[PDB]
Design an enzyme around this catalytic site. Sequence first.
Site, short mmCIF file in Angstrom:
data_model
loop_
_atom_site.label_atom_id
_atom_site.label_comp_id
_atom_site.label_asym_id
_atom_site.label_seq_id
_atom_site.Cartn_x
_atom_site.Cartn_y
_atom_site.Cartn_z
N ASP A 35 46.38 -61.50 -15.10
CA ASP A 35 47.08 -62.59 -15.76
C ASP A 35 48.58 -62.31 -15.77
O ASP A 35 49.07 -61.58 -16.64
CB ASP A 35 46.57 -62.73 -17.18
N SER A 199 61.79 -74.09 -9.55
CA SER A 199 61.48 -74.80 -8.32
C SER A 199 62.57 -75.82 -8.03
O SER A 199 63.20 -76.37 -8.94
CB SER A 199 60.13 -75.48 -8.47
#
EC number: 3.4.23.22
Length: 330
Positions: A35, A199
């Site tokens: 994770d 992004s």
Amino acid sequence: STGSATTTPIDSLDDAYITPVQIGTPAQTLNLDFDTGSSDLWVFSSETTASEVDGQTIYTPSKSTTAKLLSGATWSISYGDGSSSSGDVYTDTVSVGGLTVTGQAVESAKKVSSSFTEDSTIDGLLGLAFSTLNTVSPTQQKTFFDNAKASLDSPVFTADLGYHAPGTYNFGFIDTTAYTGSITYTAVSTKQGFWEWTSTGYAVGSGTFKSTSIDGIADTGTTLLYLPATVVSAYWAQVSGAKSSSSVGGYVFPCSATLPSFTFGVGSARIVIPGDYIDFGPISTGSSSCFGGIQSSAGIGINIFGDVALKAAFVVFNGATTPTLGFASK
């Protein structure tokens, strides 16, 4: 040193991925959910409330000659999905894919919430976010990666998750045969303890690319792709019959649909998520309404590049002095 371990989807939907981890002496192998959105290595154990264990493999520290109670240490964690767990702490030897850390904090669960109990395939979590998020008190503990870093040939790990197939976590090296083209690296902020990056935009299907900054986290422990409501609406508007369902908890779409791809930007590069990766199947057994793999982050407070996005790429978690993320197509 290096390590290399195969990671396997827990079910036919890729709801999560499990990776075998050796703990203790003699080794006890548990299948952990790696994770990159959290920083605790915790396991089902001989200390876990018996009614909260349902099929998981447990760590028994009393059977490990290298286990030592970390005196006074406790841990307690709550995840973004509302699940939680807590307990006490041992140090022990932990190996992943041939890479060994001695003295790793192994957080032994005394209590886990129902969603953990109900998932018999996940024996615990191995956190790979920054150690500043580790919950052990009163002495915060380091992640497996942080402990291994100095010994690794290169201070990196890579995530290569499969679509409906196994994949690989590598530590200490970049397998140049595992991706196509080049790896595009992008800046990371560690201020929130996550692999947080920006992004450069998105496209839906064959549509034109929209240049827009989307800050979010690379999180292997989150199944889906959570993005701003504007972006998510633009995606699902291309799917006939798709709608946001308050009763179901997100966008659903007709299971008969063929989904468009979704592209996200990494600098000037582009990662394409095939449409099929966005199908999470019937909302309930036998339903013709299917759950979408791209959902709004509006109620989260952060955008999350979860497995749906990451499994379309070869992803480098670069833990150099200034961390960065790399993405390549594959």
